[PDB]
Amino acid sequence: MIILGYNGFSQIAELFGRLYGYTADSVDRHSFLGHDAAAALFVDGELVAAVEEERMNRQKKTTAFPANAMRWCLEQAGISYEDVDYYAFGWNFTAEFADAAITGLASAPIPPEYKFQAIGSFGELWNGALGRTALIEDFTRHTGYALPDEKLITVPHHRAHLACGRTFSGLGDAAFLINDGQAEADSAIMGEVRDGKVEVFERFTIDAKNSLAQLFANITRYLGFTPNNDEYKVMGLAGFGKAPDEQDNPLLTKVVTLEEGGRYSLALANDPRGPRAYDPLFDELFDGNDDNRQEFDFRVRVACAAQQVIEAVTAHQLRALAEATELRDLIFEGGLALNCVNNTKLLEELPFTRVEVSFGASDPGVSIGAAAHVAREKSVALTPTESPYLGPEFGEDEIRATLEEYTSSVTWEQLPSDEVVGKTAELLTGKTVIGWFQGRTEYGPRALGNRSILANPSYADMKDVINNRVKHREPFRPFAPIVLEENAARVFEMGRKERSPYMTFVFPVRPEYTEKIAAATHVDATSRIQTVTEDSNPRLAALLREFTSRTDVPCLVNTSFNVAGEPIVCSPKDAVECFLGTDIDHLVIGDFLVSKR
């Protein structure tokens, strides 16, 4: 039983650019489905391989067919397209949905002129990208394998999110919340998993016009940031501000309405100007004009408001789900689980003992999920696994061959394998920013110490220094720390958590370490931490013991290894080209210590 799950449409790029004006140069360029195209391959229940097409084609959140990733996934498992039993697509645009979607459109309080325009666009998206026919054509043009209808199973988007979380959570019977920007028809659902069987409580299912995630997205656009690429900047800005009273939160009274059964709805959900309608309504709530919106204290006030909406709405949803079932082990998946601040708050302030958000809570995870969903259904007992390190590895010979292609630009020494960790630790004792390239490429949006820039957080000026050594760093972004699992409770206020290996939860820094791990903390006194063990990342675990024995510092800064708007480096080619395009001191890539000439 070989099952491959994927996500992408080659024509989705073209169609949104034309129909909705969402073009490659627009701030709305990441705001259409198919973003975070990828492949994930299960052989006999072991998740053998996975990587996002953004890492291969080097184009961020690429909506493309994941051709290079599917190539690589098959190569890793040493098979071809024809050995795969079922392909899993992480969207389920069936005829039944399209039947309901038109029927829905027909039945709506709208001038029929807007109705023709909408139904016709949905047609262009249907025929162009979404439909089972477009899919089979799209696959067949790109792989060269002609995909038998038999071998293609489309998974409901939200169900694909669910399948990702279950694969990595460790749990059995669990409650769950999926809350993403938009699915086929829903924007969020809740239910439970009991003794293998998923059950959606349809009573909580929120429609796509009442989208909590896309409200935050509109807010991100409002403040001159890229919606669907820069929402953390809002979360980030909520750090420098005080939350209003919930009765004093303009967005929580004139935009969002809390309904019984943990439901909610939005003013201007049915306005046929689309979502851009909220732009002037936001000016009418926050003094907004053309010399105040992209300002700081403005950005901060809004941010706090938006962040509180997020905290407020999701809190309601989960309260409801509390009575709806007995279970207190929660799976939170979908893109609103990217709000790591909010994730901690749900855990601590609500009745769920355990809350598991995976490194694939976002759409990148729906490629893994799509495959997992089909497998479990095929009674294929799934080998439990916690590892995000699912992408391309590189040998000692492939790195040495790449560094020789750059003899003119960099020098390098090849250290003995088990001395590297200790030599990098000695460097890291200084005001030194490091490139760290080891093991298989990590999956999802956060770098978890295989394609990382590392640095010593103990020096007070290190924040300013990292941002200066790696020019081309994207602003409004705080630095996150790595720590060994054992030092987590000592250094951070963990509450109900004993470990956070994916940077999915934020935690307050205890006062006795605030000067020691400064660079890896926000002004909120918060760190989006990655716990590390000899089991999860032995080389990374080892680095920390060497670094900590020398400095008595328990944490290293771990920030994504990339320039602005470029995705995380995948190849060693990628790593060196980045190292040279930055003022980073050194690059430790496998057993090699690269320096510049």
Ligand X SMILES: NC(=O)OP(=O)(O)OC[C@H]1O[C@@H](n2cnc3c(N)ncnc32)[C@H](O)[C@@H]1O
Residues near Mg ion (CB under 5 A) are 180, 363
The answer to whether the CB of 38 falls within 8 A of the CB of 52 is yes
138 known member of a binding site: no
Reading the block at residue 301, the tokens are 């006030």
The residue (of 231 and 574) whose beta carbon lies closer to ligand X is 231
28 known member of a binding site: no
Reading the block at residue 55, the tokens are 């890492």
What are the two backbone dihedrals, phi and then psi, of residue 509, each rounded to the nearest 5 degrees?
Answer: -90, 120
The residue (of 227 and 435) whose beta carbon lies closer to ligand X is 227
Candidate residues 336, 483, 506, 529; the one interacting with ligand X per rule CB under 6 A: 336
Strands 174-179 and 329-333: parallel
231 near ligand X, rule: CB under 6 A: yes
- The amino acid at residue 128 is G
362 near ligand X, rule: CB under 6 A: yes
Binding residues for ligand X, total number by CB under 6 A? 21
Closest distance to ligand X from the beta carbon of 370 (Å) = 12
Q: Tell me the residue length of the chain.
A: 597
Candidate residues 310, 506, 540, 588; the one interacting with ligand X per rule CB under 6 A: 310
Which position among 35, 158, 373, 522 bears the catalytic label? 35
Candidate residues 5, 34, 128, 181; the one interacting with ligand X per rule CB under 6 A: 181
Q: Could you count the other beta carbons within 10 Å of the beta carbon of residue 349?
A: 11
Which residue stretch of 213-221, 323-331, 468-476, 495-503 sits at the interface with ligand X (rule: CB under 6 A)? Answer: 213-221
3-class secondary structure per residue, 122-181: HHHHHHHHHCHHHHHHHHHHHCCCCCCHHHEEECCHHHHHHHHHHHHHCCCCEEEEEECC
Catalytic status, residue 142: no
228 near ligand X, rule: CB under 6 A: yes
Q: Could you count the other beta carbons within 10 Å of the beta carbon of residue 92?
A: 21
Which residue stretch of 99-107, 224-232, 502-510, 534-542 sits at the interface with ligand X (rule: CB under 6 A)? Answer: 224-232
186 near ligand X, rule: CB under 6 A: no
Closest distance to ligand X from the beta carbon of 366 (Å) = 7
339 near ligand X, rule: CB under 6 A: yes
d(CA 176, CA 188): 11
503 near ligand X, rule: CB under 6 A: no
184 near ligand X, rule: CB under 6 A: no
180 near ligand X, rule: CB under 6 A: yes
Strands 256-259 and 263-266: antiparallel
161 known member of a binding site: yes
**Helix pair 95-106, 112-125: axis angle to 10 deg:** 170
180 known member of a binding site: yes
Partner residues linked to 389 by β-bridges: 442
H or E element, residue 73: helix 67-77
Residues labelled catalytic: 35
Q: Residues in the site for ligand X, rule: CB under 6 A?
A: 33, 180-182, 213-214, 216-217, 227-228, 231-232, 235, 310, 334-336, 338-339, 362-363
